[PDB]
Amino acid sequence: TSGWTFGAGPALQIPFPMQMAYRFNGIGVTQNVLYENQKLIANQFNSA
């Protein structure tokens, strides 16, 4: 629900789909890769 913000202070809510997009950005992938493929990543994750 809040990613990593609650470990440094107050828990700050953000939608999870947006949490995943920041995480791809942290590894050098542009954030539209998730937003345009949200269903594919969620379905592939669920099987994995």
Binding site: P17, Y35, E36, Q38
Partner: peptide
């Protein structure tokens, strides 16, 4: 803007267009 889910409609301001024109 027809593949991302959750898009909202809003105006994006370009600073060049007004001043230039």
């Amino acid at each position: 803007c027809d593949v991302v889910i959750g898009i909202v409609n809003n105006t994006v301001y370009d600073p060049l267009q007004p001043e230039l024109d």
